[PDB]
Amino acid sequence: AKGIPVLEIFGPTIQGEGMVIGQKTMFVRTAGCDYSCSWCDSAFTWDGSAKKDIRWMTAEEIFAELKDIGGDAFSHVTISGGNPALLKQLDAFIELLKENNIRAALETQGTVYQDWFTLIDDLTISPKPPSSKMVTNFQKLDHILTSLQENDRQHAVSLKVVIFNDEDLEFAKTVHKRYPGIPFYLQVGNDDVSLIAHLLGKYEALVDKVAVDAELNLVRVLPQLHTLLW
Amino acid sequence: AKGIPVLEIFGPTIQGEGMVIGQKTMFVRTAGCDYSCSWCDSAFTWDGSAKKDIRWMTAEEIFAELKDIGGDAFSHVTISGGNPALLKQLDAFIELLKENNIRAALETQGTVYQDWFTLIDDLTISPKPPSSKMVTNFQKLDHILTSLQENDRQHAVSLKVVIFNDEDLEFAKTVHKRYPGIPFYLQVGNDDSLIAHLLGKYEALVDKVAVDAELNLVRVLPQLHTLLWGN
Ligand code: MET
Ligand code: SF4
Numbered sequence: 001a002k003g004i005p006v007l008e009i010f011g012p013t014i015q016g017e018g019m020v021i022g023q024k025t026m027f028v029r030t031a032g033c034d035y036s037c038s039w040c041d042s043a044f045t046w047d048g049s050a051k052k053d054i055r056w057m058t059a060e061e062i063f064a065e066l067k068d069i070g071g072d073a074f075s076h077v078t079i080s081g082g083n084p085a086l087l088k089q090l091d092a093f094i095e096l097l098k099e100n101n102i103r104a105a106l107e108t109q110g111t112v113y114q115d116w117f118t119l120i121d122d123l124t125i126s127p128k129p130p131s132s133k134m135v136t137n138f139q140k141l142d143h144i145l146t147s148l149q150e151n152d153r154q155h156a157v158s159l160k161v162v163i164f165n166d167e168d169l170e171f172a173k174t175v176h177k178r179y180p181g182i183p184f185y186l187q188v189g190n191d192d193v194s195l196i197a198h199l200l201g202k203y204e205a206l207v208d209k210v211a212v213d214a215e216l217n218l219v220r221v222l223p224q225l226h227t228l229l230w
Numbered sequence: 231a232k233g234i235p236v237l238e239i240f241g242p243t244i245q246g247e248g249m250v251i252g253q254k255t256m257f258v259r260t261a262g263c264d265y266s267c268s269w270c271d272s273a274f275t276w277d278g279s280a281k282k283d284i285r286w287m288t289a290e291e292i293f294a295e296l297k298d299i300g301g302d303a304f305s306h307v308t309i310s311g312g313n314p315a316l317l318k319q320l321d322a323f324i325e326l327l328k329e330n331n332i333r334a335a336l337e338t339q340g341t342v343y344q345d346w347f348t349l350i351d352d353l354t355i356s357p358k359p360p361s362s363k364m365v366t367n368f369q370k371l372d373h374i375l376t377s378l379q380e381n382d383r384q385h386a387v388s389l390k391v392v393i394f395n396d397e398d399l400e401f402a403k404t405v406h407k408r409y410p411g412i413p414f415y416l417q418v419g420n421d422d423s424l425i426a427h428l429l430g431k432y433e434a435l436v437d438k439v440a441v442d443a444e445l446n447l448v449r450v451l452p453q454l455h456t457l458l459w460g461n
């Protein structure tokens with residue numbers, strides 16, 4: 001259990017949200033989360049239901065399976081969870097992706113810092129809104145973004161906040177106004193219920209609210225391309 | 231100086247494609263295109279259908295109307311056409327946007343180069359595929375990207391090639407392999423329900439790139455503005 005807890009490896013596919021939306025990438029979803037958000041779409045990563053399905057793999061084993069699935073049709077890998085920032089062992093895998101000249105992306109809610117953050121080309125910090133029933137530690141969020149700006153990583157970091165209600169939108173203003181020099185992405189909240197027409201109505205409704213708000217000018221409102229496709 | 235040929239000024243809205251998709255911005259559409267692409271969705275910018283509807287405004291007049299439409303709910307302006315690169319007069323309007331601390335974006339096919347290219351925060355070079363029946367001058371395209379990489383503007387330039395068939399996809403490989411360092415974008419072409427048809431075209435384009443080894447550092451995106459409001 002000294003390796004990397006891997007849950008699923010699939011691709012190539014398109015990143016459907018965030019800073020690198022549309023990027024063709026391979027996904028390596030790891031296990032473990034320090035959050036228990038109310039609308040966690042990947043609860044199996046932390047509730048223990050997929051504990052038996054965990055495959056503790058080394059860095060070279062993950063890369064070998066990435067080549068058996070993606071072949072040579074990928075140059076970008078996305079690590080997700082869960083909260084992959086909880087795993088310090090990922091440093092060996094992120095370093096392995098760099099040796100093979102492969103760009104790496106990762107999303108974390110911003111509760112724990114790792115030294116290998118400086119190696120991520122597309123680092124997404126995603127603070128969770130109050131609708132998740134999670135308390136946001138802005139002190140730890142400050143330390144992470146400050147450490148990234150000191151290590152000359154501003155070009156690789158973005159902020160993404162999912163919006164389910166008007167209270168989440170006010171939370172996004174607090175995060176955006178606190179870190180003005182960081183690209184800010186607003187994502188539409190998904191409520192599992194022709195859901196494609198229901199989602200474009202939710203996306204357009206969020207765009208209309210941001211269009212009239214003067215405090216959310218340097219933001220990017222995006223939907224989830226994956227849920228619209230599949 | 232000289233007035234800027236403006237066709238329409240609206241916003242705030244979101245950018246629906248490419249380098250800064252989803253970015254809230256104000257659109258300032260200029261007139262004049264040195265191309266005549268067969269599927270030009272903005273034919274009125276160059277065919278001469280709306281010569282009377284052109285307002286030759288100065289840099290201060292355009293910025294004044296931007297504040298009347300969007301007020302303080304915008305910090306990003308996108309210049310579209312047409313081919314705004316044919317207008318040297320835009321240097322005054324872009325400098326005015328930088329003075330007011332406003333980011334600027336522009337998309338051009340990449341024929342003519344201007345000095346104010348170094349002032350664009352989100353510059354998109356969009357070479358046209360063979361389906362446009364246009365001839366791509368790669369010798370003239372190399373000059374633009376070389377000038378940007380010399381003026382330390384590689385962090386603000388991207389390539390975007392719209393795809394309608396398999397022949398356009400092979401043209402995107404030639405452009406992507408010719409400029410590896412520049413971020414590359416693939417966009418779905420619209421035949422012009424429309425929404426359910428474009429998703430099938432976007433899904434089909436994703437499946438083709440998913441098994442392609444030459445188009446790896448590529449972002450495949452549709453037209454978001456068409457999926458919400460259509461034509
Ligand atoms: C759909 S990928 C993201 C899943 C989950 N919201 C996370 O933070 O990892
Ligand atoms: S951070 Fe993501 S994976 Fe973790 S509980 Fe929240 S939604 Fe689920």
Ligand code: SF4
Pocket residue numbers: 263264265266267269270271272273275311312313339358362
């Ligand atoms: S370059 Fe763009 S605006 Fe100009 S003719 Fe071609 S499609 Fe139309």
